[PDB]
């Protein structure tokens, strides 16, 4: 089997991407944030505290004839951005773009933090990291991809995120018309539960490529590119007037600037992020200072190849016996 669904930026800055997902019988369609950096499929629901729901579409398990409460199961997750959610657990039928899993754990939120309430465009998350990170207790549950894997034509999924434009998540096949050149595959460590790999270096604009190992994670649920302070300083040094702002919490730059591109290495191959992908717009409404899309990972403990990097590439998440990651230009 295969599945294919279109993923769409939630706003004009590509702050995140949403993909429609069918849950239950009859289908309830929710727009979920596909997140290769986490492993819980959770949704706003009829159980969510009412004051915490502000425009999201909710899953109502009582209206799904295939929903079954998973007895005694709860979940609670806290994300790197400070947001969180928690609740109970049903199993139900879940379909993405024509691909169907019966018995998928659907984590129904009783509580969400303020940032989720404030984002009316995200109905929940669909985790695509490794199932060892799933938070369901006392019996950990499998991700949608883990459940679908054995049925897929090939044990893979692909992310093709657009810049200011729709894109595609495919399960079970590689669309060889979706990228240019070849796909370069690189090794993955699953020891932290992530799609963790080692970039071979970077360049800023037309500058010299610096060979240096950058360990980090391919994370479709993180907006920006988080890289070591030395690399981020080298990038923003090329932008007249850019500086690191303590009040804003990262590098900012004059909105009148034209940004240089940023290149990262995948083996001997190179992915080029165009400069405009690095512009996240005014720091506050009406400001002429703009937020940068490359920021330091120094306070994180891990580098994050988020959407800024991934949307410059066609990305294969290869769930073969030994998982690997593939990147092609597009």
Q: Please indicate the count of domains.
A: 2
Q: How many beta-strand elements?
A: 24
CA distance, first residue to last residue? 25 Å
The main pleated sheet reads as: 7 strands, mixed
Shape: globular
Task: Name the helicity range.
Answer: under 10%
Radius of gyration: 20 Å
Give the strand order, joined by hyphens, for the main sheet.
18-17-12-13-22-14-21
| Multimeric status of the protein | monomer
GO molecular function: aspartic-type endopeptidase activity
Catalytic activity: Hydrolysis of proteins with specificity similar to that of pepsin A, prefers hydrophobic residues at P1 and P1', but does not cleave 14-Ala-|-Leu-15 in the B chain of insulin or Z-Glu-Tyr. Clots milk
Keywords: Aspartyl protease, Disulfide bond, Hydrolase, Protease, Signal, Zymogen
Protein name: Endothiapepsin
